Amino acid sequence: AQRVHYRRHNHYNTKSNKVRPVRTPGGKLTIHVVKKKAGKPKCADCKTAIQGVKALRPADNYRARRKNRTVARAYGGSICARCIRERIMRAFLFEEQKCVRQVLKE
Amino acid sequence: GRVIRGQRKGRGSIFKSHNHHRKGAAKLRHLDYCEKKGYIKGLVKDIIHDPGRGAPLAKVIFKRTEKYGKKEELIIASEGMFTGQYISCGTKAPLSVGNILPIGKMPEGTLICNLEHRTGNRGTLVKASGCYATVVGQSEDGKKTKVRLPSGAKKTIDAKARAMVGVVGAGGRIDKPILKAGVAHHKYRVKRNCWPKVRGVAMNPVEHPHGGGNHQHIGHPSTVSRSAPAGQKVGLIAARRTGLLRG
Amino acid sequence: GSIKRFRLKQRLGKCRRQNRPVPHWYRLKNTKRRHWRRTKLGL
Amino acid sequence: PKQITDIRKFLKISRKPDTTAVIIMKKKSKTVITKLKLRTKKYLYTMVFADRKKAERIENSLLPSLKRIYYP
Amino acid sequence: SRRTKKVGLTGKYGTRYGSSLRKQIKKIELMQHAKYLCTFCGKTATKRTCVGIWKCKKCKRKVCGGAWSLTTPAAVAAKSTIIRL
RNA sequence: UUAUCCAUUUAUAGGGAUGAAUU
RNA sequence: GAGAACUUUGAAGACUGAAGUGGAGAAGGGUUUCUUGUCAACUGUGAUUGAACAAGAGUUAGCCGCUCCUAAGGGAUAGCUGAAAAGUGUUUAAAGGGGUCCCCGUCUCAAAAGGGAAACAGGUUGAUAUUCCUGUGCCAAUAGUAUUAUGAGUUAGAUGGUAACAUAUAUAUAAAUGAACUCCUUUACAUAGGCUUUACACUCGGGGUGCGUUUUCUUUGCACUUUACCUUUAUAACAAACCUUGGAAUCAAUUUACUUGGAGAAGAGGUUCGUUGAACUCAAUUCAAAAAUUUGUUUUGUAGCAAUAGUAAUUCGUAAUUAUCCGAAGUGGUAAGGACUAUCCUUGAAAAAAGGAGGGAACGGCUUUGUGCUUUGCUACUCUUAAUACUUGUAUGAGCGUACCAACAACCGCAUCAGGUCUCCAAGGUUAACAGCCUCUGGUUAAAUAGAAAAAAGUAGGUAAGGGAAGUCGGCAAAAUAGAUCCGUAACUUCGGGAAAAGGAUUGGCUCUGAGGACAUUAAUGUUAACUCAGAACUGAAACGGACAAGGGGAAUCCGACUGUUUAAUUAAAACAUAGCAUUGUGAAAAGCCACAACUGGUAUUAACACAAUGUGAUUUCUGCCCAGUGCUUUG
RNA sequence: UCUGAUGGAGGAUCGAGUUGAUACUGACGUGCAAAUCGUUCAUUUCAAUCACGUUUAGGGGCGAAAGACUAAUCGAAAAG
């Protein structure tokens, strides 16, 4: 079996220094340490990641692509689908409830 | 001799509370004109666990009335409150589980938690998990009520003092037995340096008045006076009686 | 260490420069010598 | 680099004043064919071919005002 | 078949600790983790989530409750008296 | 209550009959 | 070389041997690094060697780190004490910023393993390299005018989809307006268990390139066969997210495991995020049929970087050329990702920084009246990306660290000391295995010495007839099977265990045999990947987990319940601790306990299911009498 | 109810490493070593181990408690 070698000056394996080796055109096994995958914006109601977005780290999100930042319903980074439809059918529900109450108050 | 463990406790070198992961102090809403003259409803967004204590806390979001915005408060949760409900604070707020009311508004015999032993302390008494006080009397002229605390003692508090109606959550926490030293270690690791104890009779006579001897015995009465100095208050402090109780 | 402060590196260079012997032409007319292994300069 | 076969864009890129390097391979498919590489400031744009006539068409479609160099 | 005749869940403790102590946590083990009933969905599937925090398997909305029960006998009585008014 | 002492805060509205709401 | 057991070269025999005297490692050291020369001393023997001595030389960064942020915390400010020294750090912050009047806000330091702008491959030196060269990129920054273009939207801002979903491929997918004031998200987080994907790792047979015994035989024993940063690669599958619709009972999709559902499932149709970043015709095409454009079938590619760079065998000025570089898979060793399940009286960190949103202060121009506003003519327009040319300071890119050792003589042990001192890597055989044992890349063949002889004695071991603890304070030391399969397993018990109880048989060998998955045909026949069992043989020196590797059991008594901890260098325990039990004090800032000289503070981000102070010490069963003595406590 | 049919809990077991130190009261004891070497033994999913940073200072600290440790110094460190 071949033998490995460290590069990144962070010579301790931490969740910012995870290693993968792959073969190179020079014919030797050099080092390739990945970036840390980032989380996704999530549901304020049922704790589910929002959709229409990707999970780039803040440095990359500073340059991210816009159409994979928000799915197509108004806000974008607000809420998931089955939990936004609840508010969707609740809005005019509450409005009508207050309206009928203020009408039949007499 | 030398300074004993009890005296060293007060120096606060390693005996400071291990509070790196605590989520914040559990304080009631600060007194306001709105809360003094009516209800204000804030919604509890999430019930979280504070590592130091057993009783879960609640993150109640109120909407500030003097400015646009919201203010988040950490409030000891009563047994039976859930995320998404509106909790009402003030004199005119209806009485219900979790609601915070002036003490002199609710009738006698009701169960309260997160007591305020002096008007404005935003929560001082009855805060441990599963604890509750009972309002056992109101003065005829108002401005004074009597409550019975979980210790079994009656205390007189002014009627303007606020409290939550209900019982502190996570009740009965002391019911299950800690099976092993490991659970006690994990319990006290997030609280203090009070564990393990180590008997004073197993120490040397230099470090403890109980220590010494060829037979591991106290040798002198273990009921010490209330006037005993710092290095003497080590046994049963000013004990009125000893032995098994008879009710 | 392979990583060091500027002042530490400058002092190391000064000690190395001070460890050289007396010029021969001057001797024609030193006791403060240290070996890196025997005596440490204590920095 | 991008394996591109559509010729409309290939004749479109003929007006870019930044492409200078032209490299010709000579590889035996089984027949002698070639892969024509041209310089692009962001990519190593090499075009793979399937017909010697098309390769000869392209290697004269190159705008000859600039440099020529081949690895072999 | 049925491997534990009486010990049940306490089999993870082996022979350690007292029999009466394991049997006293036998009063509580069958209910700390048990699937109890939620009041917003209707399935007997609630599970322990923390020391005081509780959750079923449908609602995704947590509830403050007892140490190892959704409700405590003190807290159901206290709520009943308040509701009666 | 004025000395004095204690508590709270952004010293932030005079007394009685699970969505928001700033210019 | 004057001089060679310990300098160099070649040959041989060997070792380190998958957890290395191997590469990179940090602390610590500081020139020990390299070249040349040299041997007065040192290199405990020699020494021409050297980490010694002498002269020169050597460390190149926008992308690797520090520098930035915040934690445990440190210092300081306001005060307040104190003779000061010093003690504490908002205890009556008037403390910088923001936008355009108001809002927020002690300062500073503390991480070369936490968070974090962006670099890869080949090559190069006597000594530096992801820093130097070549090539290819990436990130951050960039002030005032005139030209362009691209795309958008418009005479103040789009698209479909029953839905989920998705929506701009110019040089780059930029082109769907926007203030104060706010609300979120990323950063951003535990452990255990298995499942799965992918790269890498290893491996198998036959195609392209080299050596060999061959007395006795060979399709003979083997050996060398590549592709970074850069592209959402598209895909596709699979894991999850998500709609229509069926409208289930003789409930159903299903997972290794359970999960999910009438707030919607069989069943069907439909749609993203996450992966490897060539896998499926992906990129086309030869040709046909759909049709004012799609579907199928054949030729090109190591999907594009990509071979040409590197690499390898024979000829060949002594500089060259050659062609290969392929069908495939199989194991699961190491990493990461995904979706899950489970555990906590344990819930497993912050900011810097970045992004999204609610709302709407302000939005088409030229000139023209009066005082930013009503008004008269033409309506062409404005921005998102890239720049180009002149004025501002010159308009890219600071400073520091980069050599070497990292112990085997460069670190600490008074030393070139068998000691101590922070990750990854593992092929075969053997295996359960990163164990042990032999070897393969790499390294070494050196240790404060060498010959010869080989007695006593010492030390580290081996083997011993017959007896088998008679030795001895005491079975001290050593031996005894010990892996695996089949069988069998008591007293007692807290019912969980005891238990590998005890106790047996076998395992040697080869000739054998058989049985147990994925791919296709109108009940059967073809292509292609396992290691688990069983019985007949005979045979071999009647002996075999053949080396390595590995439990001695049983009957009882005493102590301690257990796991754990302890007298660093004479005592590891019956000692301590521990869950359990019990007692005591305390309702609070005029409390309990404790610190402080005072100020003040710890518990306390606490509140009797709490804190503090004790004693006893699983469980089971008990815990008797005595308040006279001494303590503690209570009334009058 | 049992039998048979399925998984992955435990301060569970063996066991290298790691952390230690039971015995030989072995060697050594003018040692490699002012505590080492050999064999043996204990420990390895948690009261676990390690590193760096940081806090606690001497009639003080810290101590699962040995009069232990606090730089070869401890029934009161070291320097003057």
UniProtKB/Swiss-Prot annotation, chain E:
Zinc finger (C4-type): 38-59
Keywords, sorted A to Z: Cytoplasm, Metal-binding, Ribonucleoprotein, Ribosomal protein, Zinc, Zinc-finger
SUPFAM superfamilies: Zn-binding ribosomal proteins
InterPro entries named in the record: Ribosomal_eL37/eL43, Ribosomal_eL43, Ribosomal_protein_eL43, Ribosomal_zn-bd
GO BP term, example: translation
One cellular component term from this protein's GO annotations in UniProt: cytosolic ribosome
Membrane-spanning ranges: none
Example GO molecular function: structural constituent of ribosome
Subcellular location: Cytoplasm
The family this protein is said to belong to: Belongs to the eukaryotic ribosomal protein eL43 family.
Subunit structure: Component of the large ribosomal subunit. Mature ribosomes consist of a small (40S) and a large (60S) subunit. The 40S subunit contains about 32 different proteins and 1 molecule of RNA (18S). The 60S subunit contains about 42 different proteins and 3 molecules of RNA (28S, 5.8S and 5S).
Free-text function comment from the UniProt entry: Component of the ribosome, a large ribonucleoprotein complex responsible for the synthesis of proteins in the cell. The small ribosomal subunit (SSU) binds messenger RNAs (mRNAs) and translates the encoded message by selecting cognate aminoacyl-transfer RNA (tRNA) molecules. The large subunit (LSU) contains the ribosomal catalytic site termed the peptidyl transferase center (PTC), which catalyzes the formation of peptide bonds, thereby polymerizing the amino acids delivered by tRNAs into a polypeptide chain.
HAMAP family reported in the protein's UniProt record: Ribosomal_eL43
Protein name: Large ribosomal subunit protein eL43
Gene: RPL37A
